[PDB]
Design an enzyme around this catalytic site. Structure first.
Site, short mmCIF file in Angstrom:
data_model
loop_
_atom_site.label_atom_id
_atom_site.label_comp_id
_atom_site.label_asym_id
_atom_site.label_seq_id
_atom_site.Cartn_x
_atom_site.Cartn_y
_atom_site.Cartn_z
N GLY E 30 0.80 -1.20 0.00
CA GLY E 30 0.00 0.00 0.00
C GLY E 30 0.84 1.26 0.00
O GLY E 30 2.07 1.24 -0.11
N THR E 31 0.15 2.39 0.12
CA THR E 31 0.83 3.68 0.15
C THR E 31 1.56 3.88 1.48
O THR E 31 1.03 3.55 2.55
CB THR E 31 -0.18 4.82 -0.06
OG1 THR E 31 -1.18 4.77 0.96
CG2 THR E 31 -0.85 4.68 -1.42
N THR E 32 2.77 4.42 1.40
CA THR E 32 3.59 4.61 2.59
C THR E 32 3.09 5.80 3.40
O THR E 32 2.44 6.72 2.89
CB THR E 32 5.06 4.80 2.20
OG1 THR E 32 5.86 4.82 3.39
CG2 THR E 32 5.24 6.11 1.44
N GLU E 47 1.99 9.73 1.97
CA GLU E 47 2.14 9.91 0.53
C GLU E 47 1.09 9.05 -0.17
O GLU E 47 1.17 7.82 -0.14
CB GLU E 47 3.55 9.53 0.08
CG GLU E 47 3.80 9.74 -1.41
CD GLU E 47 5.21 9.39 -1.82
OE1 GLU E 47 5.99 8.94 -0.96
OE2 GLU E 47 5.54 9.56 -3.02
N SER E 75 -1.21 2.35 6.62
CA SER E 75 -0.58 1.90 5.38
C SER E 75 -0.93 0.43 5.20
O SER E 75 -0.49 -0.42 5.98
CB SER E 75 0.94 2.10 5.43
OG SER E 75 1.55 1.63 4.24
#
Lengths: 243, 233, 204, 241, 243, 144, 242, 244, 250
Positions: E30-32, E47, E75
């Site tokens: 996933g997105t950090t 982010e 995340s």
């Protein structure tokens, strides 16, 4: 029928496979700790290991306080450690309101053991992968230490320990009791009991620790507290001076 | 394929994915194709209706919630009726209790809570039907895209269905066009007709096949069926 | 106001030498009108007799309830129930209902089959345990029995002479109540056999 | 309790818990019955392997649900006691709710309807027994014979048999018995059932139980001596012809 | 045997769980998201990877705020991340009902901790494959916690997990040596935007988005809100200057 | 314990026989007939009933069939005048073709001990009691 | 051996896919909806000559103006009609009117996929979805005569002429060129029997086939055996022409 | 998931039977042998305990026999653990009929209520059926002396002489030819002694391994007397009958 | 939701038995061996304390519990589920008797209630059978002194003297010739010591052996005086010094 090993059922060898792996879960963290019974009190020590600098030393602890009169130390992964921690605090509160005065040490280790026995017998619940070790000072039998196994079997110990090196640490505490023929430390002051268990831990592990490398719990009569960084470092000063 | 690891809903794959979520996700890609877009003061929803026979009718792919909002379904039809009941229940809940209309932003979070309960517990299943949530409030028009996992993300416009992802080419080049068009509902409806036409292969848009529902500020949600969309073909 | 005094009833229990005598009447009425003259307030549990006086609804209902527990108790041990154990069993049955309880005057009398010592006991509307070595009575008409059994009854009486003592304290007190009469039955409890006798009195 | 489903659609479209349950009926005692104009006869056999079974103390193979209608099943005896008890309670419940005596048509659709529930109820298994309901409706002399299949499908039959060697008896009842001209006498209806039991019971007496159903709540059960009386008359006209 | 990795409660022969390890791999897909802890408060940053141009700028809020004093960023799987806050939202509402004053940071960590522990004890449910980072300003000082899929958590001076976990979190060690005495809340906002671009090397293949939210007692005074206005654009030019 | 090869021998040995009826070409001169007590435990995919269109079942014989089977074994056997063939068949209850020969063999062993040419009726009385006891065991069916 | 909620790799439930295949395993139900009425018919498929014509009834009555037919396994059909009449007759009590044919179809089809094992959020007890296909017909004062189809998958379409069961393929394509918007009520009766005669093993009679009718005035009506025999004799004259 | 660990206790086999019920019938052959006998003036019950030795307590014990009613006895052959569940519920259901209708319960009603319990686990509940079998014998004024038996499947039929447990078909062979309708109570005892001696695995037969509880009718008609033979009375009939 | 397993873990094996209770008896022989001897003047039971650690305390470990004051109990092995059974036995014994009949149940009725809990684990789903085997020994006013053997399968049998555990094969055979009709309480103790001593391969002392005897009613163990009816409980636990007195007595 390969599902016989995945749950708790009678094995063709007459044993329990999932219970054998419950003891193996405590060695994943590799945290060595021990507990000894003093004269009028009980002092427990533990090895404090912080992998990353981003961790707050005050937040990370392997010693939890169930009540004012009872301390606790648990080995193994923290999620199964804190799972039984809040369950033990609930049993200590129900005993004060409903039953009577504050709970002693043996009752807390017995109720938490019987709670794990129900989870072990029932196949839809997995057993805890940690070991419950309770230290306190009773008003009748005095200082006592009860170590609750994840299989639900509780038994009293004179000086106990934990971790994969427990068998090497037990030899240190065992040989000391065979020569003096005593079941507890005769030192009345609790300050000398703290430096007593630390001395045998350093010589056994062959490693000199620091103020942030150890957490020393102190259980007195009807009182329990955890030593801070200045109190633990102060004990290491007199150890190097005497020996 | 078939059932190896994640065939049980509570099992995780070694690659960090969930096949049950992927199985229900592929149900939308093989279902009926639909498109959509929105503007500042208006939102346009265009859906295509199919069937198994020429003599058969066309099941409506657009379900009405309230006068200020609507949705569309691409996937299994009866699975969307259960989710539509939970969305319409929250519309009347906020109307009776809070005396307010259900916002599009808050509708996506409440819809996500319904699907996450079946995925995280054995015995249930995620809904394999997609939902494009359109509506209007004091903030403006908003469009959402629902997935079998329950992911909710606000977009200008998107498409879910058979060959729907390939139809997004017209929406990307025109992305700077319909967003600046306000007060012209006729042009915004015709913009969605050219977008869905990119996915047409066998049959084109007809009177009974084309279903368009527009919502806006001064114009409430209205489903145009039959000859109402014949002029926008 | 008092549903237990509608039907009425009498019960009396004395103690002789290794002997006890329980008795009641045959009259079961309704309010001021008598109904059945053949009704009996004592059921046979074996060598332990239990009389029950009170509302006829509670009498006929509990008679099937006590035999439910005793049959489960007797078939498991393959032996008869003792009056000392049966006493604490009645108190637990009546206490099961707190606000809805049964209004009864029950008095139990029996002799131990092992030690051979006579034991009598009684209860109240709530089922309080009552134990005495002389006599225990209850019910609506018991008020006349407290004055009859106190002066007449004496300790250490012969089993045969006990029948004449309990009869004079029964028929005389039965005529002082409107709900008591229509004959009386007396059970002489001994270690060998039980003598059942009927009393001949006035009919009113 | 047990919430796990059992009946599951086979890839062919059938159900395993249904077809495999029908084999329990084919392995049980054959139950054959016919109906005439003024009478209905339900025959049933017993197990010829077991002996020393007193007929009086043994429960009858034909269960009486109501005065005017009975039930003779074939199949698992463990699943039959559930259907017999629940059909008799509903018989009194129908008299309580609607104040009407039950009808053979309502009794069959109820028993078949209850079987449809267990097939559709998760956690339970379908019945492995098939029941035959035959009787007369109140104020009606028309014969009613209904078959109840374990799958839940019910139908009316003039002459029908279930259990072991069913296809052998069914082929015998088509050519010998005619649905257009049924026998109007009771004696001809009893002899017809005995002819169907000669190819299954295979020279037996105490293992044959025949129940005669007559209108106006009249039920006469043939004894051991009365059943063998019709057997002798048929055997004399069998080998000689 | 075979199938130890199938269900949840089945332990491995070495005393670990496969389903817990499989949930960790879902966190890195996933997105950090990162975090920064200071004396006055904590700073949250995430982010959000933009797929196509169809995304509407700055209309999506990934951080779900608990009351006014607790922000939550996760995340991992989006559906599993929203269920943790929705469960913690009811715990915060149930706490403030009986207990009056709002729940502090170290207290709120126990509600999410035990709730994830119950999912690992049942075969009918699955553990959360998302790692949620939560924190804020409590009654005394401040605290920051990162909830792992295994339920293990401690105090963190900083927390980062995602595709850039090996990069962004590795830069947090330089922040400690940069300001060993302390870090202001305003400077931590500009430092949080730089860490996103330092770990952006693996995210350069797609479009990104910057969302920063902080809470402290210096300005907001116990109010967790996102950064807007010229303050957000000022941190972008300062972070992109070193890139 | 000895010849067990695990689960790999299961798939190789069975599917080898299936390929002989499918992958192996033949002009029709090779016939494969399989028989056992219970064919349900075997893999049904091994049958592949497009090759085998014939399925024959078996049940217990009736009183009329046992009279013919009994006369077969007693054709070469010497029986006395007091032995009835229909009487022995009537006493037969839940017996197969092998149980009929078992009584004929047991009756021959009793007369062999006394060395009697014609088997008397007393040998059949003791033969039917030993077969129904040991050789004939009650099946686990148990219904009715 | 899996749960009823397990999805197939195609994106569907195994209980849904195998339920549609059970339709062809049963009888064939054919019906045609016209402007003057809806002509419905079924096939009893008697396996023995001793079966009574009143035994198997595949056409029930939900309402005077609303009727339906069944095909395939009739075990799941009887349960749905009890809920269909429940969602209909009780709906009359609420609004004091007749329930819409399309609205009644939605309430019946929603009871299909609610099965499961331990369904969270409420109590739903069902072992398997209904494996029976129902053709819902009726008439109202607005849309007119309509004929729907209740599928086990929870979806429904409005068919002018629909053939389910074993005739869902061969007999279904024959109704494309034989249907017209001007088809009357009398001509539709001979058109259905023309298809039923060719798809039946033996000759067409009143015992092996049962047809019904739904009109505005008379409503739901079942053709008598004498009325059906008159339409069969008229069909033989239409088969032989040139 | 819970579907993999489930062994599917109750399912229809391709043969048309139940797996757990078919295997439960074999457990009866691995338990003690109980043989009932119904005479003209009474009913004689016989049983044999399994795994006995000198250290066993012969003073007061009954493993294979119990008393559910004054006029009704029972013979237990099977697993003892699963037996106490149905025996405890037997006396409860027997007294409920006596608590309401105020009369002695017959055997036919008592068995069918207990059989429905065994029939319940074979249908719903997803549990195993009771692997214990019972033989119910009692007195009634309706059909007279009644002798019935049960099975793990929950079925009951009338039996004049029933044999369950080890060597079921071996004992029934001697009981069929030696049975008579005029057999009295004394002659019924000799039938059980000769049967249990030849069907056992030992050489001799003692009185410690056997259990006998009969039903005798006194001089007063209408009421019988349940009498369980004590070990002192069991060794006495062995000498009088010549069994020793 | 909670648990989705409603089925019983115990199923009928194709051999005609139950696989769970068969392996349950095997697990009883995997641990310390207990024993007991019934005499005319009382019942004497004994066991051995096996310490997993040399620093463990044998005083806190009690292998002989107390259900009713007149009845003791002893198990074999480590007894993982022993604490669950005793906690559930003390509740059902007082509720069904002390809270109803007002008195403690006898020995024959108590073992039926203890087995009533174990027989449900072999049938009711979600749980597994108990892998422990207890011994119910006590005294009543009818049956007198009696000792019952509780099997892990849920069945109970009366026995004069028995020994179950790892040494159950040799110890049970030795008690056949060492038992007769006339025995005393102290005379039966020497019988238990001679048999147990041969089964102890470790340290032999009074701290590793828990000897529980049931004698007459002791007024010192009662705690109150003035009531001639209750003379005190019959069950008594011998101290560490009193056990060592009879060890050298052999």
């Amino acid at each position: 029928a390969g599902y016989d090993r995945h749950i708790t059922i009678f094995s063709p060898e007459g044993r329990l496979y999932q219970v054998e792996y419950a003891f193996k879960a405590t060695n994943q963290t590799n945290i060595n700790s021990l507990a000894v019974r003093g004269k009028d009190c009980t002092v427990v020590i533990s090895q404090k290991k912080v992998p990353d600098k981003l961790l707050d030393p005050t937040t990370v602890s392997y010693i939890f306080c169930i009540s004012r009169t009872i301390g606790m130390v648990v080995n193994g992964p923290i999620p199964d450690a804190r799972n039984a921690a809040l369950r033990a605090k609930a049993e200590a509160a129900e005993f004060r309101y409903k039953y009577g005065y504050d709970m002693p040490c043996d009752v807390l280790a017995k109720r938490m053991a019987n709670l794990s026995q129900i989870y072990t017998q029932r196949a839809y619940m997995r057993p805890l992968g940690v070991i419950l070790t309770f230290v306190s000072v009773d008003e009748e039998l005095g200082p006592s230490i009860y170590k609750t196994d994840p299989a639900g079997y509780y038994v009293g110990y004179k000086a106990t320990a934990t971790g994969p090196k427990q068998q090497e640490i037990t030899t240190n505490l065992e040989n000391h009791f065979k020569k003096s023929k005593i079941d507890h430390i005769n030192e009345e002051s609790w300050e000398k009991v703290v430096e007593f268990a630390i001395t045998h831990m350093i010589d056994a592990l062959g490693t000199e620790f620091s103020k942030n490398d150890l957490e020393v719990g102190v259980a007195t009569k009807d009182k329990f507290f955890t030593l801070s960084a200045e109190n633990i470092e102060e004990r290491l000063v007199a150890i190097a001076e005497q020996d | 394929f078939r059932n190896n690891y994640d065939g049980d809903t509570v099992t995780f794959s070694p690659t960090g994915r969930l096949f049950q979520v992927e199985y229900a996700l592929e149900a939308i890609k093989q279902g009926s194709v639909t498109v959509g877009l929105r503007s500042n003061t208006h939102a346009v929803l265009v859906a295509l209706k199919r069937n198994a026979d020429e003599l058969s009718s066309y099941q409506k792919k657009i379900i009405k919630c309230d006068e200020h909002m609507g949705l569309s379904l691409a996937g299994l039809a009866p699975d969307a009726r259960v989710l539509s009941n939970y969305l319409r229940q929250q519309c009347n809940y906020s109307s009776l209790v809070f005396n307010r209309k259900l916002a599009v932003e808050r509708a996506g979070h409440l819809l996500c809570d319904k699907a996450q309960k079946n995925t995280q517990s054995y015995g249930g299943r995620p809904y394999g039907v997609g939902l494009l949530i359109i509506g209007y409030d004091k903030s403006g028009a908003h469009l959402l895209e629902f997935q079998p996992s329950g992911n909710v993300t606000e977009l200008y416009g998107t498409a879910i269905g058979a060959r729907s992802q390939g139809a997004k080419t017209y929406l990307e080049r025109t992305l700077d066009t319909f967003i600046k068009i306000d007060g012209n509902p006729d042009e915004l409806i015709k913009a969605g007709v050219e977008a869905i036409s990119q996915s047409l292969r066998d049959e084109s848009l007809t009177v009974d096949n084309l279903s368009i529902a527009i919502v806006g500020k001064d114009t409430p949600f209205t489903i145009y069926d039959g000859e109402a969309v014949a002029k926008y073909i | 106001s008092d549903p237990s005094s509608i039907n009425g009833g009498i019960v009396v229990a004395m103690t002789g030498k290794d002997c006890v005598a329980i008795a009641c009447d045959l009259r079961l009425g309704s309010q001021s009108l008598g109904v059945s003259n053949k009704f009996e307030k004592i059921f046979h549990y074996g060598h332990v007799f239990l009389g029950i006086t009170g509302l006829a609804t509670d009498v006929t209902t509990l008679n099937e309830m006590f035999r439910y527990k005793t049959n489960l108790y007797k078939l498991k041990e393959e032996r008869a129930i003792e009056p000392e154990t049966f006493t604490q069993l009645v108190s637990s049955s009546l206490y099961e209902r707190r606000f809805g309880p049964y209004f009864v005057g029950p008095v139990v009398a029996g002799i131990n089959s092992k030690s051979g010592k006579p034991f009598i006991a009684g209860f109240d509307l709530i089922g309080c345990i009552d134990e005495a070595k002389d006599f225990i009575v209850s019910g609506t008409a018991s008020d006349q029995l407290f004055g009859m059994c106190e002066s007449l009854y004496e300790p250490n009486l012969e089993p045969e002479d006990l029948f004449e003592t309990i009869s004079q304290a029964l028929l005389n007190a039965a005529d002082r109540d409107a709900l008591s009469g229509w004959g009386a039955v007396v059970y002489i409890i001994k270690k060998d056999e039980v003598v059942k006798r009927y009393l001949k009195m006035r009919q009113d | 309790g047990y919430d796990r489903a059992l009946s599951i659609f086979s890839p062919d479209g059938h159900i395993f818990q249904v077809e495999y349950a029908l084999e329990a009926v084919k392995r049980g005692t054959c139950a054959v019955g016919v109906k005439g104009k003024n009478c209905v006869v339900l025959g049933c056999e017993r197990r010829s392997t077991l002996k020393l079974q007193d007929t009086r103390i043994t429960p009858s193979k034909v269960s009486k649900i109501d005065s005017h209608v009975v039930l003779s099943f074939s199949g698992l005896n463990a699943d039959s006691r559930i259907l017999i008890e629940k059909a008799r309670v509903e018989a009194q419940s129908h008299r309580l709710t609607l104040e009407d005596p039950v009808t053979v048509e309502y009794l069959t659709r109820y028993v078949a309807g209850v079987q449809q529930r267990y097939t559709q109820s998760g956690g339970v298994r379908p019945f492995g027994v098939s029941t035959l309901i035959a009787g007369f409706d109140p104020r009606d002399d028309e014969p009613k014979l209904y078959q109840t299949e374990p799958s839940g499908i019910y139908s009316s039959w003039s002459a029908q048999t279930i259990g072991r060697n069913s296809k052998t008896v069914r082929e015998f009842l088509e050519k010998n018995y005619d649905r257009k001209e049924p026998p109007a006498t009771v004696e001809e209806c009893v002899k017809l059932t005995v002819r169907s039991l000669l190819e299954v019971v295979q020279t037996g007496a105490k293992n044959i139980e025949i129940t005669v159903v007559k209108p106006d709540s009249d039920i006469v059960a043939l004894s051991s001596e009365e059943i063998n009386q019709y057997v002798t008359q048929i055997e004399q006209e069998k080998q000689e012809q | 045997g075979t199938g130890y990795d199938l269900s949840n409660s089945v332990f491995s022969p070495d005393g670990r769980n496969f389903q817990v390890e499989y949930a960790v791999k879902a966190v890195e897909n996933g997105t950090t998201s990162i975090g920064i802890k200071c004396n006055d408060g904590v700073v949250f940053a995430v982010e959000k990877l933009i797929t196509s141009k169809l995304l509407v700028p700055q209309k999506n809020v990934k951080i779900q705020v608990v009351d006014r004093h607790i922000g939550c960023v996760y995340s991992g799987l989006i559906p599993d991340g929203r269920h943790l806050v929705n469960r913690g939202r009811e715990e915060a509402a149930s706490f403030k009902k009986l207990y009056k004053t709002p729940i502090p940071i170290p207290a709120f960590a126990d509600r999410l901790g035990q709730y994830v522990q119950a999912h690992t004890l049942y075969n009918s449910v699955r553990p959360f494959g998302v790692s949620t980072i939560f924190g804020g300003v409590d009654k005394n000082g401040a605290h920051l916690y990162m909830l792992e899929p295994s339920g293990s958590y401690w105090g963190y001076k900083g927390a980062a997990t995602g595709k850039g976990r090996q990069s962004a979190k590795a830069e947090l060690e330089k922040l400690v040596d940069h300001h060993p005495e302390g870090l202001s809340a305003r400077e931590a906002v500009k430092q949080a935007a730089k860490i996103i671009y330092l770990a952006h090397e693996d995210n350069k293949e797609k479009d990104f988005e910057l969302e920063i939210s902080w809470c402290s007692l210096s300005e907001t005074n116990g109010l967790h809100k996102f950064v807007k206005g010229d303050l957000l654009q000022e941190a972008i030019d300062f972070a992109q200057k070193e890139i | 314990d000895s010849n067990s090869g695990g689960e790999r021998e299961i798939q190789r040995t069975m599917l080898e026989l299936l390929n002989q009826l499918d992958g192996f070409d033949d002009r029709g001169d090779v016939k494969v007939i399989m028989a056992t007590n219970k064919i349900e435990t075997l893999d049904p995919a091994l049958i592949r009933p497009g090759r085998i269109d014939r399925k024959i079942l078996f049940e217990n014989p009736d009183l009329s069939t046992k009279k013919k089977i009994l006369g077969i074994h007693t054709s070469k056997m010497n029986l006395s005048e007091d032995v009835n063939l229909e009487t022995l068949v009537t006493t037969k209850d839940d017996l197969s073709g092998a149980d009929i020969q078992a009584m004929c063999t047991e009756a021959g062993l009793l007369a062999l001990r006394e060395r009697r040419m014609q088997v008397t009726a007393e040998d059949f009385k003791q033969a039917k009691e030993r077969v129904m006891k040991n050789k004939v065991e009650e099946n686990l069916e148990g219904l009715y | 051996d899996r749960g009823v909620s397990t999805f197939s790799p195609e994106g569907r439930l195994f209980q849904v896919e195998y339920s549609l295949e059970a339709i062809k395993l049963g009888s064939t139900a054919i019906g045609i909806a016209t402007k003057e009425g809806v002509v419905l018919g079924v096939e009893k498929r008697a396996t023995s000559p001793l079966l009574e014509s009143d035994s198997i009834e595949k056409i029930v009555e939900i309402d005077r103006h609303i009727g339906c037919a069944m095909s395939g396994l009739t075990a799941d059909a009887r349960s749905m009609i009890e809920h269909a009449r429940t969602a209909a007759v009780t709906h009359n009590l609420y609004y004091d009117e007749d329930i819409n044919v399309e609205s009644l179809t939605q309430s019946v089809c929603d009871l299909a996929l609610r099965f499961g094992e331990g369904a969270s959020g409420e109590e739903r007890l069902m072992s398997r979805p209904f494996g029976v296909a129902l053709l819902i017909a009726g008439h109202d004062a607005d849309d007119g005569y309509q004929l729907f189809h209740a599928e086990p998958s929870g979806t429904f379409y409005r068919y002018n002429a629909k053939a389910i069961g074993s005739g869902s393929e061969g007999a279904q394509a024959e109704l494309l060129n034989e249907w017209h918007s001007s088809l009357t009520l009398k001509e539709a009766e001979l058109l259905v029997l023309k298809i039923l005669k060719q798809v039946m093993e033996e000759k067409l009679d009143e015992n092996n086939a049962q047809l019904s009718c739904i009109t505005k005035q008379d409503g739901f009506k079942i053709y008598d055996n004498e009325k059906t025999a008159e339409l069969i004799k008229e069909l033989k004259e239409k088969e032989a022409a040139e | 998931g819970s579907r993999r660990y489930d062994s599917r206790t109750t399912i229809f086999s391709p043969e048309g039977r139940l797996y757990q019920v078919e295997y439960a019938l074999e457990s009866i052959s691995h338990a003690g042998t109980a043989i009932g006998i119904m005479a003209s003036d009474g009913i004689v019950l016989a049983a044999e305990r399994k795994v006995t030795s000198t250290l066993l307590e012969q003073d007061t014990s009954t493993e294979k026999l119990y008393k559910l009613n004054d006029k009704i006895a029972v013979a237990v052959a099977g697993l003892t653990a699963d037996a106490e569940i149905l025996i405890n519920t037997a006396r409860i259901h027997a007294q409920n009929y006596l608590k309401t209708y105020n009369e002695d319960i017959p055997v036919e009603i008592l068995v069918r209520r207990l059989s429905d319990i065994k029939q319940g686990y074979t249908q719903h509940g997803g549990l195993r059926p009771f692997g214990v079998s019972f033989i119910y014998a009692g007195y009634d004024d309706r059909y007279g002396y009644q002798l019935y038996t049960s099975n793990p499947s929950g079925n009951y039929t009338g039996w004049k002489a029933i044999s369950v447990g080890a060597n079921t078909s071996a004992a029934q062979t001697l009981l069929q030819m030696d049975y008579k309708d005029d057999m009295k109570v004394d002659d019924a005892i000799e039938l059980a002694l000769k049967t249990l001696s030849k069907t056992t695995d030992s050489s001799a037969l003692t009185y410690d391994r056997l259990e006998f509880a009969t039903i005798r009718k006194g001089a007063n008609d209408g009421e019988v007397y349940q009498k369980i033979f004590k070990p002192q009375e069991i060794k006495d009939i062995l000498v009088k009958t010549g069994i020793t | 939701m909670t648990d989705r397993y409603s089925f019983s873990l115990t199923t009928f094996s194709p051999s005609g038995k139950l696989g769970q209770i068969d392996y349950a008896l095997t697990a009883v022989k995997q641990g310390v061996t207990s024993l007991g001897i019934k005499a005319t003047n009382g019942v004497v039971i004994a066991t051995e304390k096996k310490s997993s650690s040399p620093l463990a305390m044998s005083e806190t470990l009690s292998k002989v519990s107390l259900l009713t004051p007149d009845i003791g109990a002893v198990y074999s092995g480590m007894g993982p589920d022993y604490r669950v059974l005793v906690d559930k036995s003390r509740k059902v014994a007082h509720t069904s008797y002390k809270r109803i009949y007002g008195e403690y149940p006898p020995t024959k009725l108590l073992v039926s209630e203890v087995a009533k809990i174990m027989q449900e684990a072999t049938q009711s789903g979600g749980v597994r059978p108990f892998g422990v085997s207890l011994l119910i020994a006590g005294h009543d006013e009818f049956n007198g002194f009696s000792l019952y053997q509780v099997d892990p399968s849920g069945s109970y049998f009366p026995w004069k003297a028995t020994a179950i555990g790892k040494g159950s094969v040799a110890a049970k055979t030795f008690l056949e010739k060492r038992w007769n009709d006339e025995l005393e309480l102290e005379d039966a103790i020497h019988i238990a010591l001679l048999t147990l001593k041969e089964s102890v391969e470790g340290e032999f002392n009074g701290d590793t052996i828990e000897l529980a005897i049931i004698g007459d009613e002791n007024p010192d163990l009662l705690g109150y005086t003035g009531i001639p009816t209750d003379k005190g409980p019959r069950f008594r636990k011998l101290t560490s010094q009193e056990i060592n007195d009879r060890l050298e007595a052999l």
